[PDB]
């Protein structure tokens, strides 16, 4: 029972940290996309 | 027992998520700095 309770708490911390990491990965992706667009446009203009 | 094995597997997933998220956050900050700096280079070039 107590083992299952700590399992639940660690699972909650795990899903929270996983969502934070996935959101950071999405922000990393978005940084890459705007990098691509701006670099293409300014360098293409050049 | 099996529940202790699940405790351990959750612990590995937890530490992996911690390192993953920390590295992703620092990478996002570094990537933003790189974007801004090269933009300043490219706008100046134009």
């Amino acid at each position: 029972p107590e083992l299952l309770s700590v399992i639940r708490q660690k699972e909650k911390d795990l899903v929270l940290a996983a969502r934070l990491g996935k959101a950071l990965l999405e922000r990393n992706q978005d940084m890459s996309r705007q990098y691509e667009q701006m670099h293409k446009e300014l360098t293409d203009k050049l | 027992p099996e529940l202790l094995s699940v405790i351990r597997q959750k612990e590995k997933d937890l530490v992996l998520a911690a390192r993953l998220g920390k590295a992703l956050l620092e990478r996002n900050q570094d990537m933003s700095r790189q974007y801004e700096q090269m933009h300043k280079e490219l706008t100046d070039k134009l």
Partner: peptide, 14 residues
Amino acid sequence: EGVLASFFNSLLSK
């Protein structure tokens, strides 16, 4: 971001 996505997929499956 391959290892990142692999871990996230594995955790979503769990």
